[PDB]
Design a protein around this ligand. Structure first.
Ligand SMILES: C=CCn1c(=O)c2cnc(Nc3ccc(N4CCN(C)CC4)cc3)nc2n1-c1cccc(C(C)(C)O)n1
Ligand SMILES: [Zn+2]
Length: 294
């Protein structure tokens, strides 16, 4: 195939980026740490080859991604720093969040402490409040696209199943792609709007507090059959205030779920300790939020 260049030049802004460390795959894309050859500032670079964009519909999805993502500015959204092309590749330059994602945390720590879940879910909801205010649905919020910066703030990225909503009342009849925490109105093909991201946040909330995802089996279609039936069980050691918020979010009817603006007014947040920050040791060891050291 075409090999990816070591220095990526944009002719319009006049920048050269050094391509550095590889970070992972995602579909047609490969992701690298990339850095400006003059100013040394480091970015995440999404690189898609044009060999995988030979059909117009795949180009249109790449255009829609860039269109959505470049219109976003928020503390809890991965910041878009530009896009460029060559004859073989599409390049997008994004905020590099150095502490990976909530998925890498989840694999190390399993279930988190309630204050940590409450911390991360607040910032997830704050970033999703930005999106829904701007009429963007994300549609694929998962642990592996909620990226953690060096301070341990959540950054929503990966706008590649995202969509704008163009008129009030609009149900999208189609979702091209397979989101991880797929909502029941998507699975049945009934039609969907903003509620799909609240569903996702409920599955994230379940996963962070329980340590395993809510519907999972060995078969993805039996998992979809469970989502269709609402076949899940919150274990009895989960606090009822948190289990109540999970149950509100993971309802099979979209219109019964809370809207994103309501979430932070829930009793789960408003009667719990929400840390102002978490230290780097929370990636490794469960915090024991002590009132004095020793
Ligand atoms: C640029 C493309 C999209 N995306 C982002 O917006 C983004 C932002 N920050 C990051 N940070 C990041 C930092 C380090 C690492 N790695 C460090 C070394 N680990 C062993 C493996 C993972 C990993 C990430 N990484 C980011 N991206 C990213 C990077 C790898 C994989 C994926 C998806 C979700 C598409 O699979 N997305
Ligand atoms: Zn399609």
């Amino acid at each position: 195939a075409k090999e990816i260049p070591e220095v990526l030049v944009d002719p319009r802004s006049r920048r050269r980026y050094v391509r550095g460390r590889f970070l992972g795959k995602g579909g047609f894309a490969k992701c690298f740490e990339i850095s400006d050859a003059d100013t040394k500032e480091v970015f995440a670079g999404k690189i898609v080859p044009k060999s995988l964009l030979l059909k117009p519909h795949q180009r249109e999805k790449m255009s829609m991604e860039i269109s959505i993502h470049r219109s976003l500015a928020h503390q809890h959204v991965v910041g878009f720093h530009g896009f460029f092309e060559d004859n073989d590749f599409v390049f997008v330059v994004l905020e590099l969040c150095r502490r990976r994602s909530l998925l890498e945390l989840h694999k190390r720590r399993k279930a988190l402490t309630e204050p940590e879940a409450r911390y991360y879910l607040r910032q997830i909801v704050l970033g999703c409040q930005y999106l829904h205010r701007n009429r963007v649905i994300h549609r694929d919020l998962k642990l592996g696209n909620l990226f953690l910066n060096e301070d341990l703030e959540v950054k929503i990225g990966d706008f590649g199943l995202a969509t704008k909503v163009e008129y009030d009342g609009e149900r999208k009849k189609v979702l091209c792609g397979t989101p991880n925490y797929i909502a029941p109105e998507v699975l049945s093909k009934k039609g969907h709007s903003f509620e799909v991201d609240v569903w996702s946040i409920g599955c994230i909330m379940y996963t962070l507090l329980v340590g395993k995802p809510p519907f999972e089996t060995s078969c993805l279609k039996e998992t979809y059959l469970r989502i269709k039936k609402n076949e899940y069980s919150i274990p009895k050691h989960i606090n009822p205030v948190a289990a109540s918020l999970i149950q509100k979010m993971l309802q099979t009817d979209p219109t019964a779920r809370p809207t994103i603006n309501e979430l932070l007014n829930d009793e789960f947040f408003t009667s719990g300790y929400i840390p102002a920050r978490l230290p780097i040791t929370c990636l490794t060891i469960p915090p024991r939020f002590s009132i004095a050291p020793s």
